[PDB]
Write a protein that binds this ligand. Structure first.
Ligand SMILES: Cc1cc2nc3c(=O)[nH]c(=O)nc-3n(C[C@H](O)[C@H](O)[C@H](O)COP(=O)(O)O)c2cc1C
Ligand code: SF4
Ligand code: SF4
Ligand code: SF4
Ligand code: SF4
Ligand code: FES
Ligand code: FES
Ligand SMILES: [Zn+2]
Lengths: 162, 60, 49, 114, 235, 108, 430, 142, 99
């Protein structure tokens, strides 16, 4: 969260020095030269959640993470099995491009990219992660507190018994 | 090999120990041409040469 | 499309691309790639290698 | 040369479906899917190699931790149809059986270097 | 050379299995109540170790699955807690045990003064080895660490598991040479009760040392000889 | 029958009544055995080979298994517990499938 | 007590007087020896007065820590917040070289009970527990009889000893574990769980038994406190040097002509102690390979250091060892130091509870390496690896058993590396 | 620092955290990621693995972040060379008795142990002794 | 070795240069053969190079490194570099950008 203090410094500085000229939404998509039916596909802008198997926070939106984590992904299309060898066959050109290469630091960056190309997009915010322990086990001391069974009753004492 | 029973990567970790410092340069301060041409030879005798590096760095 | 294929492979997975860039001189072609990865990785090659 | 899956001297296949050879394949020529066998072993229900997509780099032989997959010494394996060049687990196991002694001798020689 | 218990998990046996039924006898149950009275009612699980010791003494020296389940039911705790505590500590024996449990200390101060030869003589004469019960079942051999008897280094400890809670004794035999150990084990076989404590001397007085197979009687300087000082108060 | 049976494991390296980890390969074709999915012949399967090999007696409560005789020409070194093992119920090397059993735990 | 020279404690200056059991250890003898003399007055003087007197006496803690007793007792809470206070006496005496606590439990039970009363009043503890080793069945019977007698005469309970203070004492016993001697692990064991130490950032004074403020103190400190309040703190302070004042119970074991447990003032020379009370080393002082001064936890000292070494806390710290317990173990030239240190490594591998990674794994690693060195199987670099592993264990564990496992091996490396190198080379040569 | 909030220093940078956080919680708030194995946000603190060890100027020896309460004006160092060495030693102790089952382990690509071995561990081993062996038991169909 | 130089720039001059380059390469090969050292042929670091097979089959850390190098690969620090070599056909360079 402090600073990477590496090549990323010059990367961010190059980012802030330079800027892009504003164009009408969708105009760049015509310049791209790809089939226009590509932009009929719908876009989901989301940040992956943490895998439950691992406890690392790199993939999550955390101050530790310094890598782009917002992906543009397209909706899943038909897949079938090769009759000869049972391989997974597809006709979707955009199957893996968004997952593999379309990574953005901020949600507004991905929204700007989609609006510039003309893709209709829906942004999904990650479920907030707050590292707050519950009151029962707020600290290590709470494990051996009197909360477990109450204050020890002293009615067993020989003086109190007698 | 002295690495068989003596394992310490953080001492021998050069990949993750690189950093970038920052400076600001301004046109107001004049350049030091004394550094560039004061050390330059004026006669053939004063010529100094940099020898070709024989080997690239190795850990040994 | 060699340059774009490299972007989808790991660094070790992309060495044979350089062998096949020039079928006459393979070693020299892969040498520059491994030298560049070594510079970025800050790796020192032993003298025998 | 031509690929071959290998068996232990008991007759049990060396493959343990770690799937490293499929992850390291530069050309994506290996498709592997596995299951638990009835005895309880980790074994592949599918191991097919596209020899029209293979580049014979030998990375898969380097990545295998149990020496299951090896590139055999046979270079006479031309075919008259492309379908015969899509190998499968049974064909690879047959190739390993056919060239077992030569592969074993080559591996014994190679073990000294690496 | 493993000890009695080689398993940290339950080994099903015809003697030890789920169907086996264990319950405290009425007098032992009164002892249970007295044991529990020492600890607060809400924190009743504090009695787990004394109850497990009492059940071991009653059950002839073996902590069975029925014993653990009974203790867990009485303490109103999940059985896994009693399993964990019965497995953690050494004295808890979870396998069948002989009439006598003879334990030889092998830690360093005993090993210098000859614990090795003591165990060798015992295993020769008994004929089974460490961790193995006698074919008759009279002695079960075990090795434990320091017993608190370092000045009287060559020593063994025997537990009487025959009579039960009423007649259980954990006695120390100290300053013993191999022949003395053999004599103690023969006396135990007969049923005669040997000399409690060290054989050659009373307690850790300056009386001598065990060198090799013999006791070298040396008496030099004594300290507490004489009249004891007695009561005193500052004025 | 096999179409409605629960996939089960024989128990050589597993337990007698456990679930078997299964993918959906062969489910459409109608094949429900591991070997059937990849072998279409009627020859002896490698599982048949490994069952034929008999368990080997060893001394101690742990055996080092390298798969082959030479450590660097087989499976990674593995340490197998011999506790609670007999000829009928032997321990198994996960890499190789070799079976082991020992009598040492019974104080022998 | 003379500043120049220390030694030769007289019978009049000995706290533990029936340590050898020549007299009745029970209440009749205890009263005739000066026990329970004027406990009413000492208790009635208030907890503050007792704390200041203990602080002035300079009594440091027996059992290994060496921490000042008065300051530790003063850490106890003054006013209740709804939680009772507890006194637990650590009579668990598991230590490979220490036998001293057993004599106190079996021959002076009433001094310990009276001390528990005094210390519980000093710390405001309503109830007290005397933890005893499970192996000590007869010693436990003696302590229980003492407790019952004190209850019978009203020395314990409500209005204990006639003063307006209330203290109840219980005797609890474990099932055998060296780890259960540690303060937090003892509390966990007495609560009813596995005897696994608790992380210290919560401290037992803050939260202890049943979540309530507790203090764990050794039997010897508890027993010496009442006579410290009777005889006087100046008398206690006179014997030793500065910061190291009292007398301590020295248990001499090993290759000595007479193995003895004896009471002596601290700062006696080790040679003087061994020669006078132990009868000298078997075969003379010349016949010394090494001496372990403070039980097995502390590093051993070679003969050369043992020549001028003085039996004190700070000085043994300067000599790269420690006086954990006064359990001095003597080794002859005949002794194989490697085998004894390997046996200590096996001890620590056996006594680790297994809770934290460094102890649970490194103690077994240490035992394996020491076992190979005991035969010469290892290489010469294996010693440096062993030192590195001992450094890896130290400081990174929950409790001090990792440190106690590392220290003897480090002492062996430091003082007897030559013999290890000899054994390793000769096995290769032959 | 409004009321409940305190101030802590992590690697020389000011972080504002509630008083009830521990050192590991503040380190997460600071953007520093500490290696963990036994600590879990929604489970009781254990402190057994000892992989979270950091440095506190007040404390002589490294403390476990997960179970150490943070204090006002505390300075936390997670990159000191002593911490790197301690991490490597703990990683070695974790791996000495681990089975060489990575190819047959279904955690192969998703293992915390492998990833923290690569990141916070040495590249080589010095263990030549026998490893521990356990016999597995059925815990049910799943 | 000595650089071969011609001046005309015509086809013949380049043919002569290539022949002399073959001779110079033979000289360099002879020097390499005589001075070939003994020791490691790949870098000792196993976080960028695979461990040897016996070493992976005997050590846990080497198996972990083998698995993570043959599945994920090494992570190259963010940076850019252009490295050129004297290829037989001229100067061959790679401009590598790493994030
Ligand atoms: C592994 C281990 C074992 C210990 N065993 C004992 C013991 O048996 N007896 C003892 O008095 N202290 C033992 N201690 C020291 C404990 O901290 C002890 O409860 C405490 O120091 C007593 O404080 P004191 O000096 O005021 O009596 C042990 C410590 C450790 C780490
Ligand atoms: S030789 Fe190379 S391309 Fe061919 S299957 Fe093996 S890894 Fe893939
Ligand atoms: S052939 Fe080797 S690398 Fe490929 S899946 Fe089988 S065991 Fe793994
Ligand atoms: S150091 Fe050893 S005994 Fe202490 S808590 Fe850790 S594992 Fe348990
Ligand atoms: S994948 Fe992880 S858990 Fe499985 S064997 Fe490898 S290191 Fe151990
Ligand atoms: S070493 Fe055996 S009782 Fe102390
Ligand atoms: S995460 Fe395991 S000790 Fe803190
Ligand atoms: Zn094997």
């Amino acid at each position: 969260a402090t600073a990477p203090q590496d090549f990323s410094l010059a990367m961010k500085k190059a980012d802030e020095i330079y800027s892009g000229k504003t164009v009408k939404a969708g105009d760049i998509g015509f310049s791209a030269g790809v089939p226009l039916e590509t932009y009929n596909r719908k876009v989901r802008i989301f940040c992956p959640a943490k895998a439950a198997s691992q406890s690392g926070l790199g993939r999550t939106l955390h101050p530790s993470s310094k890598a782009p984590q917002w992906k543009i992904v397209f909706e899943n299309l038909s897949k079938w099995e090769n009759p000869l060898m049972g391989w997974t066959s597809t006709a979707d050109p955009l199957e893996n491009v968004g997952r593999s290469t379309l990574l953005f630091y901020t949600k507004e960056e991905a929204a700007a990219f989609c609006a510039k190309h003309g893709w209709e997009y829906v942004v999904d915010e990650p479920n907030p992660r707050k590292h707050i322990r519950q009151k029962r086990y707020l600290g290590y001391g709470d494990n051996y507190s009197i909360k477990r069974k109450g204050v020890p009753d002293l009615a067993h004492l020989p003086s109190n018994r007698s | 090999p002295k690495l068989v029973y003596d394992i310490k990567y953080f001492a021998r970790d050069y990949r993750r120990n690189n950093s970038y410092t920052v400076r600001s340069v301004d046109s107001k301060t004049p350049f030091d041409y004394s550094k560039v041409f004061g050390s330059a030879p004026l006669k053939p005798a004063d010529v100094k040469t940099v020898r070709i590096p024989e080997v690239m760095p190795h850990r040994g | 499309g060699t340059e774009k294929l490299l972007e989808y492979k790991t660094y070790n997975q992309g060495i044979p691309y350089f062998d096949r860039l020039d079928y006459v001189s393979m070693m020299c072609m892969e040498h520059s790639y491994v030298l560049a990865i070594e510079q970025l990785l800050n790796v020192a090659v032993p003298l025998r290698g | 040369g031509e690929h071959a899956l290998r068996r232990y001297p008991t007759g049990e296949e060396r493959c343990i479906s770690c799937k490293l050879c499929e992850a390291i394949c530069p050309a994506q020529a290996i498709t592997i899917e596995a299951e638990e066998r009835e005895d309880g072993s980790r074994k592949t229900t599918r191991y097919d190699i596209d020899m029209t997509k293979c580049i014979y780099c030998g990375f898969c032989q380097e990545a295998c931790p149990v020496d299951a997959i090896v590139e055999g010494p046979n270079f006479e394996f031309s075919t008259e149809t492309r379908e015969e060049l899509l190998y499968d687990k049974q064909k690879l196991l047959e190739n390993g059986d056919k060239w077992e002694q030569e592969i074993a001798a080559n591996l014994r020689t190679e073990s000294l270097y690496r | 050379t493993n000890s009695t218990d080689v398993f940290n998990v339950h080994h099903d046996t015809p003697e030890n299995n789920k169907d086996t039924k264990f319950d405290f006898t009425e007098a032992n149950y009164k002892l249970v109540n007295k044991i529990m009275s020492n600890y607060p009612s809400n924190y009743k699980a504090s009695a787990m170790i004394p109850l497990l010791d009492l059940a071991q003494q009653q059950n002839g020296g073996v902590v069975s699955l029925a014993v653990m389940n009974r203790v867990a039911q009485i303490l109103e705790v999940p059985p896994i807690k009693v399993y964990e505590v019965a497995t953690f500590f050494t004295m808890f024996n979870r396998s069948k045990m002989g009439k006598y449990h003879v334990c030889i200390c092998g830690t360093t101060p005993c090993r210098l003064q000859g614990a090795q030869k003591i165990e060798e003589a015992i295993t020769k004469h008994l004929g089974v080895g460490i961790g193995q019960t006698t074919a008759d079942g009279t002695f079960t051999l075990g090795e434990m660490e320091c017993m608190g008897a370092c000045v009287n280094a060559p020593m063994i400890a025997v537990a009487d598991y025959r009579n039960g809670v009423e007649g259980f004794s954990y006695n120390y035999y100290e300053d013993l040479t191999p022949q003395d150990a053999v004599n103690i084990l023969e006396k135990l076989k007969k049923g005669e009760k040997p000399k409690l404590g060290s054989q050659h001397r009373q307690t850790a007085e300056p009386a001598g040392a065990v060198v090799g197979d013999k006791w070298i009687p040396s008496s030099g300087e004594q300290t507490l000889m004489g009249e004891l000082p007695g009561p005193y108060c500052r004025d | 029958a096999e179409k409605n049976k629960i996939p089960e494991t024989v128990g050589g390296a597993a337990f007698k009544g456990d679930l078997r980890g299964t993918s959906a390969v062969g489910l459409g074709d109608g094949l429900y055995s591991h070997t059937s999915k990849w072998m279409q012949g009627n020859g002896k399967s490698p599982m048949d080979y490994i069952n034929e090999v008999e368990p080997i007696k060893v001394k101690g409560l742990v055996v080092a298994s390298h798969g082959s005789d030479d450590p660097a020409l087989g499976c990674p070194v593995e340490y197998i517990s011999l506790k609670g093992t007999s000829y009928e119920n032997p321990a198994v090397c996960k890499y190789t499938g070799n079976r082991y059993y020992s009598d040492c735990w019974k104080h022998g | 007590p003379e500043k120049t020279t220390f030694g030769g404690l007289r019978d009049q200056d000995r706290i533990f007087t029936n340590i050898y059991g020549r007299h009745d250890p029970y209440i009749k003898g205890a009263e005739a020896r000066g026990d329970w003399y004027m406990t009413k007055d000492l208790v009635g003087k208030g907890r503050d007065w007792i704390i200041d007197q203990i602080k002035k006496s300079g009594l440091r803690g027996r059992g290994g820590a060496g921490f000042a007793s008065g300051l530790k007792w003063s850490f106890m809470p003054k006013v209740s917040d709804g939680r009772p206070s507890y006194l637990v006496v650590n009579g668990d005496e598991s230590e490979p070289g220490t036998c001293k606590d057993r004599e106190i439990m079996r021959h002076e039970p009433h001094k310990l009970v009276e001390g528990c009363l005094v210390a519980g009043t000093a710390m405001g503890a309503r109830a007290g527990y005397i933890y005893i080793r499970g192996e000590f069945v007869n010693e436990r019977k003696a302590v229980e009889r003492a407790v019952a007698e004190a209850y019978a005469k009203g020395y314990l309970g409500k209005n204990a000893c006639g003063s307006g203070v209330d203290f109840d004492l219980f005797v609890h016993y474990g099932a055998g574990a060296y780890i259960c001697g540690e303060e937090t692990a003892l509390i966990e064991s007495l609560e009813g769980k596995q005897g696994k130490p608790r992380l210290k950032p919560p401290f037992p004074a803050g939260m202890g038994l049943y979540g309530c403020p507790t203090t764990v103190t050794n039997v010897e400190t508890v027993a010496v406190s009442p006579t410290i309040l009777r005889r006087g703190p100046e008398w206690f302070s006179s014997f030793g040097r500065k910061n190291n004042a009292g007398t301590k119970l020295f248990a001499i074991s090993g290759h000595v002509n007479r193995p003895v447990t004896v009471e002596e003032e601290m700062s006696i020379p080790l040679r003087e102690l061994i020669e006078r009370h132990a009868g000298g080393v078997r075969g003379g002082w010349d016949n010394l390979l090494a001496i372990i001064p403070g039980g097995s936890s502390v590093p051993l000292l070679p003969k050369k250091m043992c020549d001028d070494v003085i039996m004190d806390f700070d000085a043994l710290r300067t000599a790269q060892s420690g006086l954990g317990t006064a359990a001095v173990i003597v080794m002859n030239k005949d002794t194989d130091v490697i085998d004894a240190i390997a046996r200590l490594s096996y001890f620590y591998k056996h006594e680790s509870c297994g809770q934290c990674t460094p102890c649970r794994e490194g103690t077994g690693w240490l035992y394996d390496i020491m076992s190979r060195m005991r035969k010469g199987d290892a290489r010469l670099e294996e010693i440096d690896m062993l030192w590195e592993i001992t450094k890896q264990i130290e400081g990174h564990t929950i409790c001090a058993l990792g440190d106690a496992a590392a220290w003897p091996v480090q002492g062996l490396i430091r003082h007897f590396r030559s013999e290890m190198e000899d054994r390793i080379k000769n096995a290769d040569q032959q | 620092l409004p009321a409940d909030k305190m101030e802590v220093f992590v690697n020389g940078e000011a972080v504002v955290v509630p008083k009830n956080f521990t050192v590991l919680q503040a380190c997460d708030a600071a953007g520093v990621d500490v290696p963990r194995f036994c600590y879990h946000q929604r489970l009781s603190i254990a402190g057994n693995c000892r992989m979270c060890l950091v440095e506190i100027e007040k404390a002589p020896k490294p403390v476990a972040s997960c179970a150490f309460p943070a204090g006002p004006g505390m300075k936390i160092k997670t990159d000191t060379p002593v911490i790197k060495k301690a991490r490597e030693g703990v990683m070695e102790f974790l791996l000495i008795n681990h089975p060489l089952d990575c190819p047959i382990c279904d955690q192969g690509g998703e293992c915390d142990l492998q990833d923290q071995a690569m990141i916070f561990g040495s590249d080589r081993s010095r263990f030549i002794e026998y490893k521990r062996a356990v016999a597995d038991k059925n815990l049910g169909p799943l | 070795f000595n650089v071969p130089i011609a001046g005309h720039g015509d086809c013949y001059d380049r043919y002569l240069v290539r022949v002399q380059e073959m001779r110079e390469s033979l000289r360099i090969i002879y020097q390499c053969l005589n001075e070939m050292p003994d020791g490691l042929y790949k870098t000792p670091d196993q976080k960028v190079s695979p461990p040897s097979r016996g070493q992976m089959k005997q050590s846990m850390e080497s198996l972990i490194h083998h698995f993570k190098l043959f599945s994920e690969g090494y992570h190259v620090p963010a940076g850019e570099t252009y490295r050129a070599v004297e290829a037989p056909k001229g100067e061959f360079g790679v401009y590598l950008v790493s994030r």
